[PDB]
Every structure is written in C-alpha cells, then in structure tokens.
Amino acid sequence: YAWVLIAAYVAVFVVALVGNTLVCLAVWRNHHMRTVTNYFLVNLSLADVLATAICLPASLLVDITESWLFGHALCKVIPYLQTVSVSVAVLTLSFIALDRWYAICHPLLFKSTARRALGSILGIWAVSLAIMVPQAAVMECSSVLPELAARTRAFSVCDERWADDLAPKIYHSCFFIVTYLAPLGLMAMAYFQIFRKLWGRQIPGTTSEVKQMRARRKTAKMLMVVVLVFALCYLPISVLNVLKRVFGMFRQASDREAVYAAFTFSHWLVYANSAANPIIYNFLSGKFREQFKAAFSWWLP
Numbered sequence: 203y204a205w206v207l208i209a210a211y212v213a214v215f216v217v218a219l220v221g222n223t224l225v226c227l228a229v230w231r232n233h234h235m236r237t238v239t240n241y242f243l244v245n246l247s248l249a250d251v252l253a254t255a256i257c258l259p260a261s262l263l264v265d266i267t268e269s270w271l272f273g274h275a276l277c278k279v280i281p282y283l284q285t286v287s288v289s290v291a292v293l294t295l296s297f298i299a300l301d302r303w304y305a306i307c308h309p310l311l312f313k314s315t316a317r318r319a320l321g322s323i324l325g326i327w328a329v330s331l332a333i334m335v336p337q338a339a340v341m342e343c344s345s346v347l348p349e350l351a352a353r354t355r356a357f358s359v360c361d362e363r364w365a366d367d368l369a370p371k372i373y374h375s376c377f378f379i380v381t382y383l384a385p386l387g388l389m390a391m392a393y394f395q396i397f398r399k400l401w402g403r404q405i406p407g408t409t410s411e412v413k414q415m416r417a418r419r420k421t422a423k424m425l426m427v428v429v430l431v432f433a434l435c436y437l438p439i440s441v442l443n444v445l446k447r448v449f450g451m452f453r454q455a456s457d458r459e460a461v462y463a464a465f466t467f468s469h470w471l472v473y474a475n476s477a478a479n480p481i482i483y484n485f486l487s488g489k490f491r492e493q494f495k496a497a498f499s500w501w502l503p
C-alpha cells in the first residue's frame with residue numbers, strides 16, 4: 203500500500219504546484235483577473251504552495267517511515283508552517299465570504315477594493331504567523347530508544363509535549379473551533395444568504411446591475427464549491443485531532459493499523475485540497491479555464 207500512497211502524494215504534489223503557479227500567473231499577467239476575490243484566491247494558492255513545497259514531502263516521509271528524519275529545528279518549523287498555512291487558507295476563505303456577503307447582502311457599508319484586499323491579506327499572514335507560535339513551542343523531537351539517537355533518526359518522533367493533561371484538551375478544543383468549526387459555520391450561513399439574494403426574486407428597474415448579478419452567480423457558485431471541498435478535506439484531520447487530544451482516543455496497540463491508515467488518509471486529504479482548488483477554478487470559472495487552456499496549449503505544451 204506504500205507505492206499507492208507515494209504515487210497519490212506524487213500526483214497531488216505535481217498537480218498542486220503546477221495548478222497553483224498557474225493561478226498566481228493568470229492573476230499577475232491579466233488586468234481583467236485582478237478582482238478582490240482573485241487576489242484572495244492568489245493568497246489561498248500561496249498558502250497551498252507553502253504546504254505543498256515544504257510540508258508535503260516531510261508528511262509523506264513520516265507516513266511511510268513512522269519516524270521524524272529532519273532533526274530538532276525542523277520538528278518546530280515544519281509543524282508551524284503547516285498550521286500557519288491552514289490558518290491562512292481558512293482566514294482567506296473567511297475574508298472572501300465577508301467581502302461577498304457585504305457586497306451582495308449589505309452593499310453600502312464597506313468599500314470592496316483590490317488595495318484593501320492586499321491590506322486584509324497582510325493582516326491574515328500577520329495573524330496566522332502569530333497564533334501558531336504556541337504550536338511550534340510544544341513541538342519536540344525525541345528518540346524512543348535514546349542510546350541509538352546518535353547513529354540513526356529511524357526511532358526519532360516529532361510530537362507535542364504537554365506538562366499536564368488539561369492544557370492539550372483546552373488548546374485542541376480552541377484549535378478546532380478557530381481553524382474549522384466557527385469560520386466554516388459562519389461561511390455556510392453567509393453563502394446561504396448570498397444564495398437567497400442572488401437566486402431570489404428579481405427587483406424591477408435594474409440597469410444593464412443585471413450583468414454584475416449574472417457574473418456574481420457564477421463566482422458565488424464556484425466559491426460555495428471551494429468552501430464545501432475545504433470543509434470535506436479538513437473534516438477527517440480536525441475530527442481525528444479532537445478525538446485524540448480532547449477525548450483520549452486511539453491509544454490502544456490493538457487498533458495501531460486502523461489508526462495509522464485513518465490518520466495517513468486524513469494527512470493526504472489536506473494536501474489533496476491544494477491540488478483540488480485550481481481544478482475547481484478550471485471547471486467553474488471561464489476566466490481561469492481560458493488562462494489554463496492558454497498555458498497548456500501555447501505558453502508551453
């Protein structure tokens with residue numbers, strides 16, 4: 203099953219790096235692509251490239267070897283970068299939802315500009331980089347057999363170190379709510395209201411307002427799919443983390459094989475999400491589809 207896992211990780215790594223570079227390039231090279239949503243979708247691609255390039259190979263080696271082969275320093279740095287990336291992704295999706303909700307449901311309160319989106323993007327990185335410092339603090343690299351640590355990294359493990367049994371329960375309950383449940387629950391409600399507004403009863407006297415509304419339905423439909431695919435890809439890892447850290451599950455040696463498989467699939471799924479988003483844009487955005495088609499047909503075959 204290791205060949206199947208390596209191949210799946212290789213496929214995801216290649217599709218994510220190519221797909222996400224194409225998203226960044228399409229927006230950078232084309233003025234018509236520089237919309238508020240597409241600036242945030244570029245930020246999602248930057249967070250997804252950070253995870254794919256630096257964290258995906260380390261995660262594939264842990265899932266294959268059942269050991270940490272990158273030393274003490276990277277045992278703090280790689281978990282930190284993976285968590286920062288999840289925070290940038292979820293906060294980016296939250297700010298898109300917020301932008302679309304105000305623009306469509308409450309149009310005359312806040313100004314939606316590309317320059318304000320760049321300020322929001324910097325804020326997302328500033329917040330994500332700071333709130334994940336406690337995650338890096340608890341990461342520790344230890345050898346299961348101390349007397350062999352000097353000759354091999356085979357029996358070395360990277361894991362969280364907690365001084366008491368209550369602190370990880372409080373921390374991981376907050377982690378789940380902040381990185382998954384509260385932003386996705388709020389986004390679901392925002393998109394339900396956007397759905398009712400865009401697909402609801404047409405108000406008469408609207409100007410050739412008609413074009414923006416048609417364009418908005420296409421974008422909202424795409425964004426709802428991105429949010430639903432994010433919710434599904436991050437559901438196993440989020441649930442497994444809570445059950446392990448808060449409810450003290452998966453500690454029995456008899457279950458080792460079932461637990462290994464479930465956690466390994468949940469780790470791959472996170473990375474599969476970085477590969478999924480450019481594929482979603484290709485099928486649900488004629489603008490991105492046109493750019494990707496140009497990239498594979500004449501920019502470079």
Ligand SMILES: CCCCCCCC/C=C\CCCCCCCC(=O)O[C@H](COC(=O)CCCCCCCCCCCCCCC)COP(=O)(O)OC[C@@H](O)CO
Pocket residue numbers: 296297299300303379380381383384385386387388389391392394395398399
């Ligand atoms: C750390 C977080 C950081 C992220 C922060 C950024 C997150 C920003 C994301 C999006 C911004 C947009 C938010 C807008 C949310 C809009 C919420 C909303 O209005 O829906 C309500 C449903 O409530 C309801 O009964 C349902 C009540 C909630 C159900 C409980 C599930 C909890 C999951 C989530 C809980 C989070 C709460 C956060 C607490 C501060 C009322 O609808 P209503 O009837 O008018 O009909 C709808 C339709 O028919 C209108 O045409």
Ligand SMILES: CCN(Cc1cccnc1)C(=O)CN(c1ccc(OC)nc1)S(=O)(=O)c1ccccc1C
Pocket residue numbers: 257261264280281282284285288337360361377381382436439440443468469470472473
């Ligand atoms: C507390 C963080 N967490 C929960 C979580 C909920 C939702 C989204 N991501 C992570 C974990 O499961 C723990 N971690 C994890 C493991 C593999 C992986 O593959 C996508 N993703 C995250 S970790 O601290 O970032 C870590 C730990 C040890 C080795 C490598 C890494 C990246």
Ligand SMILES: CCCCCCCCS[C@@H]1O[C@H](CO)[C@@H](O)[C@H](O)[C@H]1O
Pocket residue numbers: 248249251252324327
């Ligand atoms: C091709 C690039 C893909 C890798 C993704 C990483 C993007 C860099 S985010 C960057 O992190 C810095 C931390 O020092 C902050 O100073 C910046 O304000 C913030 O914007």
Ligand SMILES: CCCCCCCCS[C@@H]1O[C@H](CO)[C@@H](O)[C@H](O)[C@H]1O
Pocket residue numbers: 307308311395
């Ligand atoms: C200049 C001030 C303009 C801002 C005034 C806000 C008007 C409140 S509308 C209110 O908004 C909610 C969220 O969309 C819906 O759930 C409700 O059903 C709907 O009645």
Ligand SMILES: CCCCCCCCS[C@@H]1O[C@H](CO)[C@@H](O)[C@H](O)[C@H]1O
Pocket residue numbers: 293317318319321322325326329
């Ligand atoms: C819990 C929320 C944490 C996410 C951090 C982002 C905070 C918003 S930054 C702020 O956003 C404005 C528009 O939103 C821009 O006009 C500004 O120039 C910029 O500085």
Ligand SMILES: CCCCCCCCS[C@@H]1O[C@H](CO)[C@@H](O)[C@H](O)[C@H]1O
Pocket residue numbers: 278279282331332335336337338339340
């Ligand atoms: C922009 C904010 C940058 C700081 C993020 C830290 C990245 C992991 S390095 C690591 O951080 C730990 C505390 O988190 C400490 O135990 C170590 O001394 C230090 O080597």
Ligand SMILES: CCCCCCCCS[C@@H]1O[C@H](CO)[C@@H](O)[C@H](O)[C@H]1O
Pocket residue numbers: 367368371372375376448449
């Ligand atoms: C807002 C954060 C809320 C986190 C929820 C923590 C619940 C974990 S189980 C709970 O933990 C206690 C301390 O270990 C024990 O006294 C109880 O017997 C046990 O049932």
Ligand SMILES: CCCCCCCCS[C@@H]1O[C@H](CO)[C@@H](O)[C@H](O)[C@H]1O
Pocket residue numbers: 375376378379444448
């Ligand atoms: C704070 C974030 C992490 C915690 C989320 C898990 C909530 C579990 S509550 C759970 O609901 C069940 C429903 O059937 C009851 O049977 C149980 O008695 C009760 O334990």
Ligand SMILES: CCCCCCCCS[C@@H]1O[C@H](CO)[C@@H](O)[C@H](O)[C@H]1O
Pocket residue numbers: 440441444445449450451
């Ligand atoms: C959405 C992610 C949060 C998980 C919510 C599902 C409810 C958790 S069932 C959990 O099962 C354990 C083993 O029987 C017990 O220790 C706990 O009492 C019980 O609560």
Ligand SMILES: CCCCCCCCS[C@@H]1O[C@H](CO)[C@@H](O)[C@H](O)[C@H]1O
Pocket residue numbers: 441
């Ligand atoms: C979105 C998916 C959420 C799934 C949450 C899983 C929580 C189930 S834990 C555990 O499972 C056992 C099955 O045998 C039951 O006997 C126990 O009563 C229960 O505590």
Ligand SMILES: CCCCCCCCS[C@@H]1O[C@H](CO)[C@@H](O)[C@H](O)[C@H]1O
Pocket residue numbers: 375448449450
């Ligand atoms: C904001 C508060 C959030 C509270 C969510 C905790 C749900 C309590 S279920 C209860 O407690 C422990 C897990 O918390 C488990 O060890 C037990 O098996 C289970 O029966």
Ligand code: NA
Pocket residue numbers: 250291472475476
């Ligand atoms: Na992602």
